[PDB]
RNA sequence: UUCGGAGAUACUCGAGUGGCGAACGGGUGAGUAACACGUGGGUGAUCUGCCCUGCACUUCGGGAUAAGCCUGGGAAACUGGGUCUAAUACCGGAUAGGACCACGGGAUGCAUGUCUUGUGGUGGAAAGCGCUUUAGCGGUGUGGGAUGAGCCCGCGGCCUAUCAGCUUGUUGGUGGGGUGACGGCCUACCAAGGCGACGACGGGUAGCCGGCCUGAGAGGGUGUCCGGCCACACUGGGACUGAGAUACGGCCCAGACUCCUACGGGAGGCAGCAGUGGGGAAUAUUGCACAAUGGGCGCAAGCCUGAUGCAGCGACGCCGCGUG
RNA sequence: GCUCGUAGGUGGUUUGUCGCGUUGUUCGUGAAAUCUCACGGCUUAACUGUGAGCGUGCGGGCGAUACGGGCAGACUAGAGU
């Protein structure tokens, strides 16, 4: 009958999810937006940095980007089937 | 398993004497059988073949065993023939040979397989035993007073005694200084066509 | 619950252990969480280590020792120091040494001569 | 069954089963009567209903049947949907 | 004391109720080209029996029933009814914030927010048993650990274009439903998308890995012992119970095959250990023990353990030694 | 057979900047066994215990800016008018 009651938690440093930077391809989703990322690794055998491009899809709570578009992404729990990232902010927009 | 065949058969047929002091040997120091007496074709496979195998017919060792010696010689630093011939200088039969309790080589193995020596207080019967810096080599107490160990009491001089190894007075005992390096090792072989033989 | 348990890992008719917090719903031989120690039962007295600063965190934690893991926690002390007994002082007892290889060899060259 | 226990336990399987569905029928009857009160758009009723059938969600999350999330979600959804009549 | 009938009062204990375990351990590699595995992250989107610790509490009542006893059906396997008796079985209240709703501050950021506290309105637990006289074990709600687990993502490891158009719950949104949890996971409605020559959709083959063999290395081949994870348990499908289920030695349906029958109906599942048959060039004992180590239950002694420890058989391999 | 051109690969001189590639360091991780090395124990060996490497990688943090790339300009030799 001497203790706090509350014991307070062990502080569990907050870990960070990943952030990535691509252009638009596609916009016409509804609160949906297609980013087109890109990142270059060496081939195994040879030696040559290969660039390859992937396409993920992200969540926009207001559907303001079109195509072209830089865009901030950073990723997120599930949303749909296939939506696992949300869009941050819009640096550079389409010219 | 071991040869137990003719000793000087295998000495003709290498052209070399491979154990110590033979008569039938210079007699007949070319090759045995019924052609014996030719010119042959000395191929280089025959010159690093033959090189091998007078160390395998000097130390009484199997071609499995004597391949395992190879295994870590090529794999220890410093050079290959040194180690090798290192290794197996130091197998507690041929340290009997050196410190002249024996008169030849395959008296000395029976010597160490028959159970009449010790290393450190214990009971050893194996000849490939290796000995390391250090070592005391006695000899069992039951094996004093017998007729091999005592005919080899007198004769302490006629052999010369390496320098990596010692012996004493009546209490027969044998002590290691360190292992032998190259100079005190006795050569009836080169150390090189062995090492070259095994990258055939 | 988390179990504190031994580990055989030696010969035929050598068995070596090892100390070793693993889980209940786990075999002998599987992957323990962590090794503190080790056990060799041939030894004459034995071979025992306890790491005795992890075997403070899991015992603190809650990792319930077998019954051999409780006597050798008994014999070094760590279960006396946990739960407040007075024998906090190791018990184990190393096996009368020999003397090394350098000094047999150069009694016998004081022997010799 | 083999082994002398799991006929044992083949007989204590039917009674839980039993004692779950029950427990479990009568908390689909309790939300349906709230449907339905609360379809009528009273809010007298709907407001001693809610307090009756949130307390049935409770009682069958203490008693192992359904599990404490469970309780949680099912009373959080007709509360709720009570605020919007 | 009967001269083979007794005395629940009584240690002890078959059957029975209740608890916990049975989801571990052991096996196999058919399926699987996949978040299955390897490695690295996320979980502000989650669960976690037993174990450890901090803090609260352990309060009133009630109705049955297995067993027993008496009877009915059935060839069996099994099953019906009447009475009868308990509990830490079950059921209903009182009070108990980490359930829920609304409004608050306070800290926090990585957008949904999270954490901590305030007011008001709704709420939800428990179980006792033992005692030589420090025998001792349990119960329930909540804070925090530890552990085990679920789910999502980056990247990596086959052949085939003599497979080039695939996709309609499909791709996204909203409102509900659902789950431990996010989510087309499900549903209605609305939008008309999504994927692909960096190989989509097909076809062929395959458990993946630590590793093993080879090679100077780089590579190529491989996944056997041992260790990790996964998948399955006669074939196919389904749920129940539970902290947790591909439920090998559980359930229910269907199918094939074997067996029992009084023809009405029933029973079974060695890819556990040992063993038999068959196939094959070819792969072993119907062994011993819980002494050790690990596990289940128990206050404990103990009981259980074909896990495991060992032994038998085969030059099957490696290593060592003899036959002088 | 020869050309044109899509995707793709590659790209002159120079200023500034970013720090993705690249490079330095440190932390976390890369289980155990196996493998290499060194000591110990089985009479030796195989086998087995311990210590250190290895685990070529991946994530986090902090330095460097020559080269490659991105971004913002300059230039005229390549190319075109
Ligand atoms: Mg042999
Ligand atoms: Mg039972
Ligand atoms: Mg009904
Ligand atoms: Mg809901
Ligand atoms: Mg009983
Ligand atoms: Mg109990
Ligand atoms: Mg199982
Ligand atoms: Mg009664
Ligand atoms: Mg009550
Ligand atoms: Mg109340
Ligand atoms: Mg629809
Ligand atoms: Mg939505
Ligand atoms: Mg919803
Ligand atoms: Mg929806
Ligand atoms: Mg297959
Ligand atoms: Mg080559
Ligand atoms: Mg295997
Ligand atoms: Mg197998
Ligand atoms: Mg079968
Ligand atoms: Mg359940
Ligand atoms: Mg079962
Ligand atoms: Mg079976
Ligand atoms: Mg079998
Ligand atoms: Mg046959
Ligand atoms: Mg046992
Ligand atoms: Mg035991
Ligand atoms: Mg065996
Ligand atoms: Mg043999
Ligand atoms: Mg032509
Ligand atoms: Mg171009
Ligand atoms: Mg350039
Ligand atoms: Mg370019
Ligand atoms: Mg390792
Ligand atoms: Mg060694
Ligand atoms: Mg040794
Ligand atoms: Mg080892
Ligand atoms: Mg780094
Ligand atoms: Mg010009």
């Known amino acids: 009958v001497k203790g706090p009651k509350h014991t307070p938690r062990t502080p569990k440093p907050r870990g960070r999810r990943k952030t990535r930077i691509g252009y638009v391809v596609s916009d016409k989703m509804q609160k949906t937006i297609v980013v087109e990322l890109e990142d270059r690794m060496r081939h195994p055998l040879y030696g040559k940095i290969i660039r390859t491009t992937k396409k993920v899809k992200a969540h926009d709570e207001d559907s303001v980007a079109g195509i072209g578009d830089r865009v901030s992404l950073m990723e997120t729990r599930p949303l749909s089937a296939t939506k696992r990232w949300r869009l941050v902010e819009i640096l550079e927009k389409a010219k | ?200 | 619950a988390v179990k504190i348990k031994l580990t055989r890992l030696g010969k035929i008719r050598n068995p070596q252990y090892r100390v070793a917090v693993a889980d209940a719903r786990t075999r002998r031989d599987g992957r323990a969480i962590e090794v503190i120690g080790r056990y060799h039962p041939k030894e004459e007295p034995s071979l025992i280590e306890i790491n005795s600063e992890r075997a403070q965190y899991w015992l603190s934690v809650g990792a319930q020792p077998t019954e051999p893991v409780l006597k050798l926690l008994k014999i070094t002390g760590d279960w006396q120091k946990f739960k407040g007994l007075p024998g906090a002082q190791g018990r184990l007892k190393v096996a009368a040494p020999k003397p090394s290889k350098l000094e047999v060899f150069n009694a016998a060259l004081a022997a010799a001569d | 069954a083999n082994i002398k226990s799991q006929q044992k336990r083949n007989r204590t399987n039917e009674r839980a089963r039993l004692r779950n569905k029950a427990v479990k029928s009568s908390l689909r009857t309790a939300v349906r009567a709230f449907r339905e009160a609360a379809h009528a758009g009273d809010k007298a009723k709907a407001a001693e209903l809610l307090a009756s059938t949130n307390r049935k969600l409770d009682k069958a999350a203490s008693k192992g049947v359904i599990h404490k999330n469970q309780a949680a979600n099912k009373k959080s959804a007709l509360a709720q949907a009570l605020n919007k009549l």
């Open chain 2, 1 to 200: 398993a071991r040869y137990t065949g003719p000793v000087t058969r295998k000495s003709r047929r290498l052209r070399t004497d491979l154990v110590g002091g033979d008569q039938a040997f210079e007699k007949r120091p070319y090759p045995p059988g019924q052609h014996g007496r030719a010119r042959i074709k000395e191929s280089e496979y025959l010159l690093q073949l033959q090189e091998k195998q007078k160390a395998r017919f000097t130390y009484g060792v199997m071609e499995k065993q004597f391949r395992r010696y190879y295994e870590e010689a090529v794999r220890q630093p410093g050079k290959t023939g040194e180690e090798l011939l290192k290794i197996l200088e130091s197998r507690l039969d041929n340290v009997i040979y050196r410190a002249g309790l024996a008169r030849t080589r395959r008296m000395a193995r029976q010597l160490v397989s028959h159970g009449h020596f010790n290393v450190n207080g214990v009971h050893v019967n194996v000849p490939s035993y290796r000995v390391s810096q250090y070592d005391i080599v006695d000899v069992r107490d039951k094996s004093l007073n017998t007729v091999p160990f005592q005919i080899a009491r007198e004769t302490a001089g006629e052999r010369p005694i390496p320098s990596w190894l010692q012996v004493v007075g009546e209490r027969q005992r044998v002590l290691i200084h360190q292992l032998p390096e190259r100079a005190q090792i006795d050569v009836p072989l080169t150390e090189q066509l062995i090492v070259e033989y095994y990258s055939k």
